Point group: C5
Chain length 104, copies 5
């Protein structure tokens, strides 16, 4: 599910929260004017994951990519904080969100 | 389980030992004023994992993130050494702690 | 499957889209005259994955290698954007494309 | 099992060979006076894995940590070359040693 | 299996092709005079994987280590291009070679 901390951080930004997304594609592109990391949902929505050249965005963007990659490979849900101001929309946070059953 | 060495190292500091935590969320955030790595337990407690720009904190923080990520993805327990001087609490050490059966 | 965004990006380049490729070999070569990363399909086609020394090609090429590697290890499909202007053909984008069942 | 080359390399040093260790904990610690990577066996023995700032110890220590981490996550045996000049003992080599059956 | 391109590249060098090797040990060593990455087969043969300090050998040697590690951990075959001018033999290329059934 979604952590309260993740919801609170997305509420402090213009980016929109997207809950319980199943990612089915991750791509890396080095073509001259289309460079970057793209992810797509089961519903056919695409996002761009921005990179980072300087501390701390360098390690943080690398962790965003690791999470997106594991979600596609392991078929595990994520929550996103995404800016609609771009095409495709830009991921500014990602949360790995394995679905756990609570039987009580 | 928890290693004696992990308990001894947390006992050498003002940070508190937290044993047998199941992590269910890991997040990476590059939003302007919420940047960082966050983890949440099955109980709804959140910690922040500090980064490292300089040797040795750079590789050590990278190993803390790898441990936290594998714990969420594989549903494996961790032990934490966490400072309560922060909100959220800061992880200063993490131990991967797969539950092993001993039948004797 | 293939994302619309991946097809749109390949349509913006001289590179050709190859859909639903099963990779069965990945290699790393440090021989003087054959240096680089090679991938081969079940059909016996080979591509070269270019490296990157400078941001952003450094992280993007690293993610292309991670995707190709996971595809071979997990026997999971990819989509490629490949330039025929080279021997072997050069990968300029790769998309991890696990086959999902839709029963509706 | 243990490779001949691993035993020969440990025999070339003051460090002691430890065969068929099951690791059950790995930890990364960024506390002021306990910084480092620690690993613990099923028997309750602990070692320290030294870091490396400069080529080649930087990549070699990184591979030592990857091996120890995989061993704990996958419950796979290692062999160690450890210096007893330190408490805890310092790992100067580690070998991933998955147990294979030979029925002949 | 072995890709035609991998055989053709090894045939253009002094190094010898070794097909369908099962690796059962990978080691990382930081001892003064034994430093490096070693891999050993089920047959008891050992190779050394050379490191790389400068682009492109730095990323290519890192991918050779990733391939060898996955082969040991997942019990998956590799093909090697190895120089017999060294003892142990030096790997100049490695190909991940998961065994596929072809029922036709
Ligand atoms: Na918001
Ligand atoms: Na948009
Ligand atoms: Na303490
Ligand atoms: Na095209
Ligand atoms: Na071509
Ligand atoms: Na010795
Ligand atoms: Na040859």
């Amino acid at each position: 599910g979604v952590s309260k901390t993740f919801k609170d951080k997305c509420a402090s930004t213009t980016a929109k929260l997207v809950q319980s997304v199943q990612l089915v594609n991750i791509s890396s592109d080095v073509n001259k004017d289309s460079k970057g990391i793209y992810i797509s949902s089961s519903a056919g929505k695409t996002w761009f994951i921005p990179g980072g050249q300087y501390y701390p965005d360098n390690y943080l963007s690398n962790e965003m990519r690791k999470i997106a990659m594991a979600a596609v490979l392991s078929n595990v849900r994520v929550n996103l904080c995404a800016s609609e101001a771009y095409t495709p929309n830009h991921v500014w946070a990602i949360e790995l969100a394995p679905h756990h059953h609570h039987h009580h």
